[PDB]
Amino acid sequence: ENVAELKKSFNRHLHFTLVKDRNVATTRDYYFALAHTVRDHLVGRWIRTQQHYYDKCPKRVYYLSLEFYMGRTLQNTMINLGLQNACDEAIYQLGLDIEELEEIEEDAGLGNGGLGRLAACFLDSMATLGLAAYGYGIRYEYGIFNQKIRDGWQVEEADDWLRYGNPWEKSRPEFMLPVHFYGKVEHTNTGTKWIDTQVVLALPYDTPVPGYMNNTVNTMRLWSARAPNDGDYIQAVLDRNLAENISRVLYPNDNFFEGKELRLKQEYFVVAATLQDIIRRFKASKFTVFDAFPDQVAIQLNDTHPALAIPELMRIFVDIEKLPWSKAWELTQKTFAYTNHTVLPEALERWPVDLVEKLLPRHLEIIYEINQKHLDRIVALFPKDVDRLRRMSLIEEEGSKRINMAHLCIVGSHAVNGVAKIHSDIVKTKVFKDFSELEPDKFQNKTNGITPRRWLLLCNPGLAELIAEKIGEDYVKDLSQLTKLHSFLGDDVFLRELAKVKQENKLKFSQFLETEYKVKINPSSMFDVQVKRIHEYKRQLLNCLHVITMYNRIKKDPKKLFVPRTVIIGGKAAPGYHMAKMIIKLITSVADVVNNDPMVGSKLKVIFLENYRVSLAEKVIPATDLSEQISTAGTEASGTGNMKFMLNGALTIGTMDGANVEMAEEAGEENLFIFGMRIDDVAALDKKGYEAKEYYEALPELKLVIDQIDNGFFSPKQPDLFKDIINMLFYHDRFKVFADYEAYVKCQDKVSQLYMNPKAWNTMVLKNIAASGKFSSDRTIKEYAQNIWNVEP
Amino acid sequence: GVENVAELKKSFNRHLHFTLVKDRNVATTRDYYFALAHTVRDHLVGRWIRTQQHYYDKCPKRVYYLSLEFYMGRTLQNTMINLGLQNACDEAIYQLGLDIEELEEIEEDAGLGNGGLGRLAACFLDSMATLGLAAYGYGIRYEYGIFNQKIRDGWQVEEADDWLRYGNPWEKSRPEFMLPVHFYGKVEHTNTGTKWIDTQVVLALPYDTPVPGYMNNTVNTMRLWSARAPNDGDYIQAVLDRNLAENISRVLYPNDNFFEGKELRLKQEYFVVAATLQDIIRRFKASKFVFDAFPDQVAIQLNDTHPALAIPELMRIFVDIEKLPWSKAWELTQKTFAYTNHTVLPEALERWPVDLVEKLLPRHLEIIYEINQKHLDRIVALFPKDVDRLRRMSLIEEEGSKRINMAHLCIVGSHAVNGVAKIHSDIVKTKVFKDFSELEPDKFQNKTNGITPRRWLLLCNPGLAELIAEKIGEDYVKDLSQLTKLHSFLGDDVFLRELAKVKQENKLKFSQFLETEYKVKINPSSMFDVQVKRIHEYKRQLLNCLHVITMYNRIKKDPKKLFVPRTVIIGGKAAPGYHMAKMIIKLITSVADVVNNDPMVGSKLKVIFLENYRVSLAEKVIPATDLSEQISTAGTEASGTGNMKFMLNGALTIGTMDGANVEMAEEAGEENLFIFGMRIDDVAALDKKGYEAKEYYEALPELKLVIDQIDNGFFSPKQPDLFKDIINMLFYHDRFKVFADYEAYVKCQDKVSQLYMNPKAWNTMVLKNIAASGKFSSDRTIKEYAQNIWNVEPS
């Protein structure tokens, strides 16, 4: 707890746990010794917390997700346990630099983006609020791949994150479980029997989730695939890899459905294990016995990925626990709650019934029965409307039959929510109209949030300290306290101190940029940042057009006053996403021309931030002046990066989409740079018909950019390299890039104006930060606790 | 002894809490085991760091035992004993209200070996550490060791030995020493020399396991390498294909004394060799180093031919990497390497097809050719005429598909070659490699195998170790020859009663195991007749089987005739692809089922096929053995070591004058062992003449019956011709002349029975074996290797 004792513990671990001394100890060794030293501080409360849940039996919440974008654990753990300052001092006294040791830790990147990071922020919040929550996922041997740029292109490298070992995970062999696949169904007189199946074992690994300063430590249980133990002998042993390939790697797709059998196996794998583990726990507690199940258990479905949980639970209740269908179904609906995270057609999960029949025979039967009972009702309430039956069916018939997992989640759940007002609204009245009309009270909204511990206290200590010195540390657990910040809007000194914090973050992050990339950084320039997964809907392309735009204006009139900028664009593209990869090449091509043109000089620098991940977001976010949140209105369910930048002192330029809409409401629309078409404008443009060749014909600045991109100005060695981009823009652009081009650029010009007025710029910054309270994930979970899970802190 | 138990207790509770995240209410037995292991493990650290730091500071010559196998067994008790902590830990576990025996059984055996070869490496490590030698073991960290064997419907069934599933607290990853290993690619001959390009790369991640000397503060290292894919069409598939590179250290080839020319196997051999040589070279350069002193600082023992590629690999490093001239490098090489021949069985000789090698290790095939060219140029110069000698001495075999004779490469590439027992070393030197020793006489030597007295006496038989200690002191633990002092008790009946009692307690404890694992009811007063080793035709478990049946037919002949009761135990694993071995298992289990259930035989005889024979089990049945079966055909067992364990543990041996049996006889007196059957010369004479198994069948009533019973379905009614392959082998393809030794073997057994009815004489003979086993301590073997091969002294 104190410095002297932390030094002894560190040396004790370096010695007994790493078998090293100071002369032969590696940096990794020091990091592991520090990690173990901090890890020991959690054990007492972790056992105590789990024991408490058993003795008092509070209702349990289970967040079931295929993704958990956790990032690094060491610093986070030191902050939530109140050890950082002590450890920093101890390490320094041992002659080491804690910051260097921290960089050794590999990110636990078992997610793709928002969906996976949301889940991670939720666990932190649930632990901070003292809830009996458990996160359940898959312990991927490989998480989201590590990204590199070779010759301007994204190159993928396996993210072998467990290679050197993971001190934050705890194998729980006594809770191992078998998961079945294939086989056939047998309807006997003693119940239905799913037999002749292939078995794969699931070994759970527990990771502690410490709440912020509250003595609570929950658990994140991730499952690992293992071959059972019961032709060529060698091949047979090697073939054990097949089963174990189930939890081998995370599918690297963000907002896109890939119907691969292996993925279907991962979905069921995590689902079968989790539900059996929850049932066992339930039956092992202080408890026909199952009638109290929904009062003791709440399972949240993170998107439709774990949709199979609905029939799996039914399978268990009926075939194993011998409950009648009617009862089983009732308990199921009371147990599950579904969160819809997207409206993009390509992201919708539709599994071919053929694939499901072969792999999960008993589950196909259960899904069919669920649909029968479901459609019999509709037929009753609407004897005529037969087209309504087709639109609400769990099965799609057009061509090869498929299963609409989202429909399956709606009927098997008692609550369904979008992740932002505009998204939830679209989900309730448009996408699932036929369902909400019958069950209105079933649909809700639960606007996303981000944890102020990792995304403020951890990533920007300077800002957390400044805020804390002015209004106390109360805000860490109740972010709505940041509103008190309005009391200092005319405080010139607090405004200079606010600016100093940002500048320090920029100077430090600049050192990172000149170290990782050649480029020379103008530390006074404006840090224009857009970091997120590469997507056509997110429009990194639109941003790219503006950069080329600024570049030409500079070449055109070199002597014309230009507010300097450092444009940073980063994010991974799904491996099979061709257009995303091309977009990356374009950006890298532009930067090369821009960063090396003598006429532009320190006026404009462009950086493609490589390997964007949680630990990297913690560095660049505190260093940002301008946050790009420019996806086409109605395409971004919510967004969370936007919230991160808001809490850390950046201004936002974006469209009225996702949570951007709610940010404007909290801070006031004038304090954000909103632009472009809105949900209604995009629809009108659709009914009419989007003809992109019109804006190109009516906007010279855009035409120059387009011609340069099309004629090879950015790829001399390959004149037609960006042909596919141009082709999509002129004939296949569902995200209407050309349509928001003019408004975007004019918006960008106003940002530049404001940037030249420090007093005005920071004043707005302060109103934003003051208005960010709403976006703490503690508030999100609070609403989940009260309106869906019915549990208390 | 004060404050030692209390601190062990505190520490134990500290680990259960911080290391296992458990309290006394939720802890599993496995958690208690891991808690004790970490508690014991902490006592190795100080000495391990200190030991290795010392070898760095004093720079003694280092010995490197390179092997594809290390059959280590359990580490817990062994570590406690060598560190002098068993008594204190036993007491700490007890006071904590726990059953220490229950905890130790939790530990998984590190069975990274097939049999005696892998176990010898293990024993050698323990001894080298006990003698304080700067020794290092080098092998592969298999994810799956030798398979767990189960008996289903009388047949052997193999189950994957997933020994790392729950974690191994005894290994320590050393990531900073990872290394790249190359495969495939091609050879480019440029002006900058020869270059091996276009290669596929695999990484080698070493894992160090501490090897504690006995009561001397020395803690050596065993470094095992694990294969990992390097970080650098379809994304998901590409990531899944990383399993291919990792398959190289996935599982141990389960073959004992048998060459299987598989590509994966060749990859394992090169893998451990390339990782090891690079690491050894890196250590040399990091010490007070150009390479002229290498052979004076480095000695690498090649355990059999499996790591043969180490020779051309060192040449490759020396010439292609270090740029040394060929002549100089070849010189450094021979001085560095030493080869130990572990077998003369033709089916066990590694002969790789030149094509497989060219495709996988092209640069190495060129180097092997060049060594052969030089080598043969020498023969030619010494014997201008004799062209046949070239053919018999070449590393390349031409007949049909060209293959590489790895034995020959090891010989020319080494300064010393040895066998593992007088008779085998003589065979190697004068017959198999006759043309070679004639040129270099001094090169060939002998190094009689040994076993470590710590695991095979102190640990597995605490009763006998204490008995002996109360009579002649503890000195014998560090010098086994001190066992001859037991002779003073040749007349003391009191002592003989005590010796019989210890043996009795072991049989009673082991009987509990048997009846709990098998339906059979044991007669604790019966003679424990045991044959536990890998199932082989040359080891002749059949012969033994022919005796059990011969006996069965005798009891059914006169149910009232005095019969010396026996509990016959035959165990061992069969290589998955070894058809005849599996047939022999099915024949032994079938016979057993007929003898164990025959009402007329009752408590006179019981057959038990001991399932899953392995180091931990060996430690169980060995101390409980009365008679040891070591009956391999003369000239087939290069040495054997089981024989040694049994001898040291109070059992009498019935066997042929093969391997180390000859030397056991010389040491204890040929009449203090039941020797029988043909001898090497008798075997040769029978070969020259011609073996006609049918004659002995024709001339031996008791035998003819046993056979007719096997061939007609007496032991397999549902399947009358089930044992056809066995009958057909015994009659027209028996290279191990089973029947030829059947008559001698049966008469020999009757005498064993006779002697057993006489407690006083039986135990007297036993005492004579225990007092003469000192020569078979691996500490003696290692000392001899050190003086005459490695040229090093006890650091």
Ligand SMILES: O=C(N[C@@H](Cc1ccccc1)C(=O)N1CC(C(=O)O)C1)c1cc2cc(Cl)ccc2[nH]1
């Ligand atoms: O594995 C040991 N410590 C552990 C310490 C550790 C634990 C968890 C995460 C990181 C480090 C170790 O070095 N690793 C576990 C990792 C893996 O799974 O590969 C790497 C260890 C200490 C020790 C001390 C003695 Cl005397 C003998 C064997 C020993 N092993």
Ligand SMILES: O=C(N[C@@H](Cc1ccccc1)C(=O)N1CC(C(=O)O)C1)c1cc2cc(Cl)ccc2[nH]1
């Ligand atoms: O893994 C931990 N201890 C280790 C302890 C251990 C180490 C070596 C062999 C057996 C046990 C552990 O339980 N295992 C390593 C094995 C594996 O890799 O499967 C199983 C551990 C302790 C701990 C304490 C906190 Cl607060 C959080 C996470 C934690 N993990």
Ligand SMILES: *Cc1c(COP(=O)(O)O)cnc(C)c1O
């Ligand atoms: C927060 C975060 C995201 C989510 O970003 P959006 O802009 O909301 O899409 C994605 N990736 C990482 C690494 C993050 O930290």
Ligand SMILES: *Cc1c(COP(=O)(O)O)cnc(C)c1O
């Ligand atoms: C000693 C030992 C061997 C050796 O068997 P022999 O053929 O008797 O030399 C094989 N397996 C195990 C488990 C051993 O302990």
Ligand SMILES: CC(=O)N[C@@H]1O[C@H](CO)[C@@H](O)[C@H](O)[C@H]1O
């Ligand atoms: C399928 C998917 O990854 N959806 C993503 O979910 C997160 C968390 O709700 C949203 O912020 C984001 O806008 C959306 O694209």
Ligand SMILES: CC(=O)N[C@@H]1O[C@H](CO)[C@@H](O)[C@H](O)[C@H]1O
């Ligand atoms: C190739 C091989 O496994 N050889 C085996 O080695 C051991 C240890 O040297 C000998 O005792 C045994 O007789 C022999 O069969």
Ligand SMILES: Cn1c(=O)c2c(ncn2C)n(C)c1=O
């Ligand atoms: C988002 N996304 C992908 O992630 C993707 C894709 N095609 C392949 N992938 C992987 N498409 C068309 C797409 O929009």
Ligand SMILES: Cn1c(=O)c2c(ncn2C)n(C)c1=O
């Ligand atoms: C690496 N890479 C790509 O990833 C790529 C490409 N063209 C299209 N793509 C997606 N080219 C030319 C290329 O070198």
Ligand SMILES: Cn1c(=O)c2c(ncn2C)n(C)c1=O
């Ligand atoms: C020892 N041995 C084997 O181990 C073996 C074999 N055939 C296959 N195997 C595996 N043969 C004929 C054999 O003698």
